[PDB]
């Protein structure tokens, strides 16, 4: 198929493995999540513009709005974690092991 | 309804103007005589091609030419 679709899929998998392998921060996890969303936006837009399928032109707007509201919810969770512990480190969020 | 309105126009005239402008925006197209003409102009704007019809023999209201009398006219749009 289209050569640019390979790169946008590989970008989604790169941001996936970034999100699927944490280093320290929850903010970097949310950045990898929104990079995944960015690659989803670009790939959906390239398909819908390529197809000349008219009514799905409003679909990437809905994706962007819903997932940025999702991102605001994630930043509020990060803010409550940082208000609890002082950092946004993922190793401070291990009380639920026992 | 009269003393409260004067009191809130003294205290918060910004919000009184806001709810007045918003309320007129809501209820005024239902009382406007020109709201029909918006619909009529938007459906009379020819973005596409008026694809012709095969004259089977009996379509008296469909013209054979643009300048023929039968057909949807726009005298109301020129005149208003």
């Amino acid at each position: 198929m289209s050569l640019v679709y390979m790169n946008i899929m590989m970008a989604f998998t790169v941001s996936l493995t970034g999100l699927l392998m944490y280093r320290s921060h929850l903010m970097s996890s949310l950045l990898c999540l929104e990079g995944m969303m960015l690659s989803l936006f670009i790939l959906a837009t390239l398909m819908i513009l390529n197809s000349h399928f008219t009514l799905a032109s409003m679909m990437p707007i809905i994706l962007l709005v819903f997932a940025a509201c999702e991102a605001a919810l994630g930043l509020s969770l990060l803010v409550m974690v940082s208000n609890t512990y002082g950092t946004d480190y993922v190793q401070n969020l291990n009380l639920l092991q026992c | 309804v009269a003393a409260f309105l004067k009191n809130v126009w003294a205290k918060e005239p910004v919000l009184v103007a806001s709810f007045a402008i918003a309320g007129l925006a809501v209820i005024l197209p239902t009382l406007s005589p020109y709201t029909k003409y918006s619909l009529m102009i938007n459906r009379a704007t020819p973005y596409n091609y008026p694809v012709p019809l095969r004259d089977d023999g009996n379509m008296p209201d469909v013209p054979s030419h643009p300048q023929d009398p039968q057909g949807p006219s726009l005298e109301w749009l020129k005149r208003l």
């Binding site: 390979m6 590989m10 903010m27 950045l31 990898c32 513009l49 940025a68 509201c69 919810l73 | -």
Partner: protein
């Protein structure tokens, strides 16, 4: 080179995702995602999605990454090996993919992909006196009634949800 401009922007897009996905810091992660959003927006702009590209700039980079950097300025304190190693690993993998698909004109990682430029797959028609993408986005109001209902309800609930959980009581 100029015919392959969307491919070159896509390679810069993958390089930017490798740049911040290796996660040097949330600050430089945000910077890399900003540059990635810009070049992916250029990818979208070169197919005719002008409104959707400016939605990237105005909404994604204009609001959301501003809020991510705003929150990162309130989380971390200002003043490696795994980051740079994973960066050059992803760069080697991506340039090996580029070299393979440019020497063979067919590659199969998960799906089959063409090696020519993506200019071939466009349409040879005109739209008239409108952008088709603009009219399909304008149809969010006349056709997309239920979509606007659920999106506005989700945003109002999002306002209520953020005020509930950040209150702390």
């Amino acid at each position: 080179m100029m015919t392959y401009i969307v491919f070159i922007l896509s390679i810069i897009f993958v390089m930017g995702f490798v740049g911040f996905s290796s996660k040097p810091s949330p600050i430089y992660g945000g910077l890399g995602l900003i540059v990635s959003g810009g070049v992916g927006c250029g990818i979208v702009l070169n197919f005719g999605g002008s409104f959707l590209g400016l939605m990237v700039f105005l909404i994604y980079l204009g609001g959301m990454m501003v809020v991510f950097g705003y929150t990162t300025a309130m989380a971390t304190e200002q003043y490696n090996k795994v980051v740079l190693g994973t960066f050059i690993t992803g760069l080697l993998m991506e340039f090996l993919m580029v070299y393979y698909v440019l020497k063979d004109k067919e590659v199969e990682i998960v799906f089959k992909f063409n090696g020519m430029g993506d200019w071939v797959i466009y349409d040879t028609g005109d739209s008239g006196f409108f952008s088709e993408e603009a009219m399909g986005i304008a149809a969010l109001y006349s056709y997309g009634t239920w979509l606007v209902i659920v999106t506005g309800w989700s945003l109002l609930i999002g306002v209520v949800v953020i005020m509930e959980i950040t209150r702390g009581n």
